[PDB]
Write an enzyme that holds these catalytic residues in place. Structure first.
Site, PDB file in Angstrom:
ATOM      1  N   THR A 137       6.858   3.422   6.913  1.00  0.00           N
ATOM      2  CA  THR A 137       7.919   2.441   7.098  1.00  0.00           C
ATOM      3  C   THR A 137       7.875   1.326   6.060  1.00  0.00           C
ATOM      4  O   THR A 137       8.538   0.308   6.253  1.00  0.00           O
ATOM      5  CB  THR A 137       7.832   1.809   8.493  1.00  0.00           C
ATOM      6  OG1 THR A 137       6.513   1.278   8.679  1.00  0.00           O
ATOM      7  CG2 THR A 137       8.121   2.828   9.581  1.00  0.00           C
ATOM      8  N   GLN A 151       8.015  -6.277   0.123  1.00  0.00           N
ATOM      9  CA  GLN A 151       8.023  -5.059   0.918  1.00  0.00           C
ATOM     10  C   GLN A 151       9.170  -5.095   1.912  1.00  0.00           C
ATOM     11  O   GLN A 151       9.574  -6.158   2.395  1.00  0.00           O
ATOM     12  CB  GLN A 151       6.691  -4.841   1.668  1.00  0.00           C
ATOM     13  CG  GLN A 151       6.319  -5.931   2.663  1.00  0.00           C
ATOM     14  CD  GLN A 151       4.971  -5.658   3.338  1.00  0.00           C
ATOM     15  OE1 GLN A 151       4.150  -4.898   2.819  1.00  0.00           O
ATOM     16  NE2 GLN A 151       4.746  -6.268   4.492  1.00  0.00           N
ATOM     17  N   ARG A 200       8.414   4.344  -2.993  1.00  0.00           N
ATOM     18  CA  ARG A 200       7.344   4.380  -2.007  1.00  0.00           C
ATOM     19  C   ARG A 200       6.272   5.366  -2.459  1.00  0.00           C
ATOM     20  O   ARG A 200       6.589   6.464  -2.910  1.00  0.00           O
ATOM     21  CB  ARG A 200       7.894   4.789  -0.630  1.00  0.00           C
ATOM     22  CG  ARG A 200       6.825   4.949   0.445  1.00  0.00           C
ATOM     23  CD  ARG A 200       7.407   5.152   1.855  1.00  0.00           C
ATOM     24  NE  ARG A 200       6.394   5.793   2.692  1.00  0.00           N
ATOM     25  CZ  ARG A 200       5.315   5.178   3.181  1.00  0.00           C
ATOM     26  NH1 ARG A 200       5.107   3.881   2.967  1.00  0.00           N
ATOM     27  NH2 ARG A 200       4.431   5.871   3.893  1.00  0.00           N
ATOM     28  N   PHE A 201       5.008   4.965  -2.332  1.00  0.00           N
ATOM     29  CA  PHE A 201       3.883   5.895  -2.444  1.00  0.00           C
ATOM     30  C   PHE A 201       3.394   6.202  -1.035  1.00  0.00           C
ATOM     31  O   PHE A 201       2.759   5.350  -0.400  1.00  0.00           O
ATOM     32  CB  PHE A 201       2.750   5.297  -3.277  1.00  0.00           C
ATOM     33  CG  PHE A 201       3.104   5.050  -4.723  1.00  0.00           C
ATOM     34  CD1 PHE A 201       3.755   3.876  -5.103  1.00  0.00           C
ATOM     35  CD2 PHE A 201       2.741   5.971  -5.702  1.00  0.00           C
ATOM     36  CE1 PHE A 201       4.058   3.621  -6.436  1.00  0.00           C
ATOM     37  CE2 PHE A 201       3.033   5.733  -7.038  1.00  0.00           C
ATOM     38  CZ  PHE A 201       3.695   4.551  -7.412  1.00  0.00           C
TER      39      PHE A 201
HETATM   40  N1  LIG Z   1       1.035  15.360   3.743  1.00  0.00           N
HETATM   41  C1  LIG Z   1      -0.096  14.667   4.355  1.00  0.00           C
HETATM   42  N2  LIG Z   1      -0.830  15.477   5.092  1.00  0.00           N
HETATM   43  C2  LIG Z   1      -1.944  15.005   5.756  1.00  0.00           C
HETATM   44  N3  LIG Z   1      -2.289  13.705   5.650  1.00  0.00           N
HETATM   45  C3  LIG Z   1      -1.542  12.864   4.895  1.00  0.00           C
HETATM   46  C4  LIG Z   1      -0.445  13.327   4.242  1.00  0.00           C
HETATM   47  N4  LIG Z   1       0.107  12.298   3.575  1.00  0.00           N
HETATM   48  C5  LIG Z   1      -0.644  11.198   3.811  1.00  0.00           C
HETATM   49  N5  LIG Z   1      -1.660  11.546   4.625  1.00  0.00           N
HETATM   50  C6  LIG Z   1      -2.678  10.671   5.110  1.00  0.00           C
HETATM   51  O1  LIG Z   1      -2.042   9.465   6.045  1.00  0.00           O
HETATM   52  C7  LIG Z   1      -2.578   8.317   5.708  1.00  0.00           C
HETATM   53  C8  LIG Z   1      -1.514   7.408   5.062  1.00  0.00           C
HETATM   54  O2  LIG Z   1      -0.278   7.564   5.706  1.00  0.00           O
HETATM   55  P1  LIG Z   1       1.109   7.539   4.751  1.00  0.00           P
HETATM   56  O3  LIG Z   1       2.377   7.532   5.642  1.00  0.00           O
HETATM   57  O4  LIG Z   1       1.139   8.636   3.711  1.00  0.00           O
HETATM   58  O5  LIG Z   1       1.003   6.213   3.780  1.00  0.00           O
HETATM   59  P2  LIG Z   1       1.002   4.672   4.363  1.00  0.00           P
HETATM   60  O6  LIG Z   1       0.414   3.792   3.285  1.00  0.00           O
HETATM   61  O7  LIG Z   1       2.407   4.228   4.708  1.00  0.00           O
HETATM   62  O8  LIG Z   1       0.108   4.644   5.786  1.00  0.00           O
HETATM   63  C9  LIG Z   1      -1.014   3.761   5.866  1.00  0.00           C
HETATM   64  C10 LIG Z   1      -0.836   2.839   7.061  1.00  0.00           C
HETATM   65  O9  LIG Z   1      -1.912   2.866   7.764  1.00  0.00           O
HETATM   66  C11 LIG Z   1      -2.325   1.323   7.999  1.00  0.00           C
HETATM   67  O10 LIG Z   1      -2.599   1.090   9.192  1.00  0.00           O
HETATM   68  C12 LIG Z   1      -1.119   0.515   7.539  1.00  0.00           C
HETATM   69  O11 LIG Z   1      -0.140   0.397   8.647  1.00  0.00           O
HETATM   70  C13 LIG Z   1      -0.626   1.273   6.551  1.00  0.00           C
HETATM   71  O12 LIG Z   1       0.746   0.959   6.305  1.00  0.00           O
HETATM   72  C14 LIG Z   1      -3.704   8.675   4.677  1.00  0.00           C
HETATM   73  O13 LIG Z   1      -4.859   8.766   5.308  1.00  0.00           O
HETATM   74  C15 LIG Z   1      -3.294  10.067   4.110  1.00  0.00           C
HETATM   75  O14 LIG Z   1      -4.500  10.820   3.711  1.00  0.00           O
HETATM   76  N1  LIG Z   2       3.718   2.723   0.054  1.00  0.00           N
HETATM   77  C1  LIG Z   2       4.379   1.767  -0.806  1.00  0.00           C
HETATM   78  O1  LIG Z   2       4.831   2.100  -1.850  1.00  0.00           O
HETATM   79  C2  LIG Z   2       4.473   0.315  -0.342  1.00  0.00           C
HETATM   80  C3  LIG Z   2       3.501  -0.217   0.446  1.00  0.00           C
HETATM   81  C4  LIG Z   2       3.569  -1.505   0.863  1.00  0.00           C
HETATM   82  C5  LIG Z   2       4.643  -2.281   0.483  1.00  0.00           C
HETATM   83  N2  LIG Z   2       5.612  -1.743  -0.297  1.00  0.00           N
HETATM   84  C6  LIG Z   2       5.550  -0.460  -0.723  1.00  0.00           C
END
Ligand SMILES: Nc1ncnc2c1ncn2[C@@H]1O[C@H](COP(=O)(O)OP(=O)(O)OC[C@H]2O[C@H](O)[C@H](O)[C@@H]2O)[C@@H](O)[C@H]1O
Ligand SMILES: NC(=O)c1cccnc1
Ligand SMILES: *[C@@H]1O[C@H](CO[C@@H]2O[C@@H](C)[C@@H](O)[C@@H](O)[C@@H]2O)[C@@H](O[C@@H]2O[C@H](CO)[C@@H](O[C@@H]3O[C@H](CO[C@H]4O[C@H](CO)[C@@H](O)[C@H](O)[C@@H]4O)[C@@H](O)[C@H](O[C@H]4O[C@H](CO)[C@@H](O)[C@H](O)[C@@H]4O)[C@@H]3O)[C@H](O)[C@H]2NC(C)=O)[C@H](O)[C@H]1NC(C)=O
Ligand SMILES: *[C@@H]1O[C@H](CO[C@@H]2O[C@@H](C)[C@@H](O)[C@@H](O)[C@@H]2O)[C@@H](O[C@@H]2O[C@H](CO)[C@@H](O)[C@H](O)[C@H]2NC(C)=O)[C@H](O)[C@H]1NC(C)=O
Ligand SMILES: *[C@@H]1O[C@H](CO[C@@H]2O[C@@H](C)[C@@H](O)[C@@H](O)[C@@H]2O)[C@@H](O)[C@H](O)[C@H]1NC(C)=O
Ligand SMILES: *[C@@H]1O[C@H](CO[C@@H]2O[C@@H](C)[C@@H](O)[C@@H](O)[C@@H]2O)[C@@H](O)[C@H](O)[C@H]1NC(C)=O
Ligand SMILES: *[C@@H]1O[C@H](CO)[C@@H](O)[C@H](O)[C@H]1NC(C)=O
Ligand SMILES: *[C@@H]1O[C@H](CO)[C@@H](O)[C@H](O)[C@H]1NC(C)=O
Lengths: 209, 209
Positions: free
Chosen positions: A112, A170, A105-106
């Site tokens: 989730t 995913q 995961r990134f």
């Molecule tokens: N340690 C941190 N501190 C402050 N902000 C953070 C941090 N880490 C990430 N952010 C910010 O939190 C945000 C990313 O959250 P994330 O949990 O990391 O990764 P995602 O890809 O699963 O979340 C993206 C979801 O949002 C959409 O709606 C979809 O549902 C996506 O799945 C970024 O703005 C970061 O700058």
């Molecule tokens: N954050 C991830 O690595 C990711 C995002 C969407 C689907 N699978 C993995």
């Protein structure tokens, strides 16, 4: 021929981008980090990654976010980013992840969405900002896990988005990653547990015989 | 060698009848001794440990009908789609859009493709799909681009053959050769898939704003 920006974007590839912080491409955290991983395994997941496709930074933000200006936020695909079938419904099923399976995961552990260990970045349909580092223990916000107790997830193909083709798989969890760890369903792997080819193979799925 | 888990020495090819020195232990079912050294195939196989942690005869005992040369690989149920908690395959009919790039290990009389660049371990293929049959296509590897949209079965790949699977597979209703002859696919030269930008996605439109 590979480069940060498509050649068309020069001489001024950052035109229209408001500089905020020099860690990021053009100073914009939404455009991801200037520095990318140079070592296995992470460099293998990024080897096919053209961060803007054939677009330039402002075109990329104009297409995928609400504003090129700093107040713009990335817009995400419908139906949790599952690939849509011919009836415009997401393709997925509830599925049990077996003990032993490796996931990565990134992003932060409040998310989730996971992928199978080693999926290319472009298969995940993620924007460049998921490569930003928030914790020095996890460069590029890259986390690897192994299933320690069976649990059910939404499982299905990833729709293309963010100028990438998607089409990894995913796993969309009902509990965030941190809760799965704290409840004993996942454990974190360190680099020595995923830096050899054999660690990417599958010993847990039984054979037909 | 490093073809084999260290535990398999001495005589890692125990139980395997030698046929042809192009292949590991001389057995075409175990794939070629020499692996690709150039992008993208080296990227696609960087995480591939062809036996997992098994020795060659153990691998064939688990995944084939016989360790003897007449044994054949046994394939997963439901055309290899990952199964949901009700033991039904996860898939949908999906339209592949013009511009999408696909690839395949196998002859054009088959029907299984993957998104361009998917790691070999995501495909749940046996080692023999890497055998070269035509010198024009080293490692059986073919790349295509969609030139007319068409519908396929699209879904996640179940683990098999000691690999994790969990790429996306496209199962076509006409074999690949018919799709080419009918104008749905064209064949790509290596020059068309050896740059990072060629792996990005220019065809999927951005969200409506
Ligand atoms: N340690 C941190 N501190 C402050 N902000 C953070 C941090 N880490 C990430 N952010 C910010 O939190 C945000 C990313 O959250 P994330 O949990 O990391 O990764 P995602 O890809 O699963 O979340 C993206 C979801 O949002 C959409 O709606 C979809 O549902 C996506 O799945 C970024 O703005 C970061 O700058
Ligand atoms: N954050 C991830 O690595 C990711 C995002 C969407 C689907 N699978 C993995
Ligand atoms: C994905 O799309 C598939 C169709 O897509 C089109 O066709 C393909 C080939 C491509 O060209 C694509 O580009 C097109 O868009 C779709 O396939 C359909 O699947 C259903 C369910 O499997 C099939 O229904 C079954 O048909 C057979 C055959 O029926 C004929 O013969 C019988 C003789 O017995 C006659 O009685 C019929 O009237 C027909 O003349 C039936 O035998 C079968 O009946 C059995 O199963 C049903 C289940 O509902 C029971 O009710 C019955 O009692 C029987 O037990 C099914 O009715 C359908 O034929 C097939 N269409 C085509 C064109 O092949 C597929 O389902 C889609 N998949 C997903 C995941 O969405
Ligand atoms: C996939 O399963 C969910 C239900 O899963 C249960 O609840 C989750 C929170 C998680 O804890 C799982 O392990 C559980 O097994 C389905 O959502 C339910 O759908 C039914 C059908 O309409 C509905 O009546 C319930 O209220 C839903 N429950 C919740 C919690 O949302 C979901 O539909 C399944 N998806 C597929 C594609 O089968
Ligand atoms: C977002 O902000 C826009 C203005 O941003 C400012 O002006 C531009 C020209 C740049 O200099 C930028 O760095 C500045 O911060 C507004 O026009 C727009 O309406 C705002 N969007 C929303 C949704 O409020
Ligand atoms: C499959 O092969 C088994 C072993 O065959 C023997 O070994 C190979 C290397 C050849 O030399 C062959 O001529 C030998 O007979 C048989 O025992 C078995 O019956 C064969 N068929 C099946 C269905 O298992
Ligand atoms: C902002 O830039 C400074 C360098 O001046 C750097 O130390 C800091 O980490 C940057 N902020 C973020 C969130 O990266
Ligand atoms: C081994 O197989 C290759 C490819 O099928 C062939 O070119 C070669 O001649 C074979 N060697 C022998 C000894 O048959």
């Amino acid at each position: 021929e590979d480069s940060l920006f498509p050649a068309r974007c020069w001489p001024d590839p950052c035109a229209g981008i408001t500089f905020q912080n020099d860690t990021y491409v053009c100073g914009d955290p939404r455009l991801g980090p200037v520095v990318l991983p140079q070592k296995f395994p992470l460099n293998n997941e990024l080897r096919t990654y053209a961060r803007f496709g054939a677009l330039c930074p402002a075109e990329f933000l104009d297409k995928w976010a609400t504003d090129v200006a700093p107040n713009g936020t990335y817009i995400y695909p419908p139906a949790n980013g599952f690939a849509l079938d011919t009836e415009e419904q997401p393709i997925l099923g509830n599925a049990t992840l077996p003990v032993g399976m490796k996931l990565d995961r990134f992003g932060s552990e409040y998310g989730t969405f996971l992928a199978p260990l080693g999926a290319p970045y472009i298969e995940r349909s993620l924007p460049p900002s998921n490569l930003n580092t928030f914790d020095g223990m996890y460069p590029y916000n890259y986390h690897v896990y192994q299933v320690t107790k069976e649990f059910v997830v939404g499982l299905g193909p990833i729709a293309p988005w963010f100028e990438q083709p998607g089409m990894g798989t995913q796993f969309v969890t009902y509990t965030n990653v941190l809760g799965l760890i704290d409840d004993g369903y996942l454990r974190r792997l360190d680099e020595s547990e995923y830096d050899e080819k054999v660690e990417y193979s599958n010993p847990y799925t039984p054979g037909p015989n």
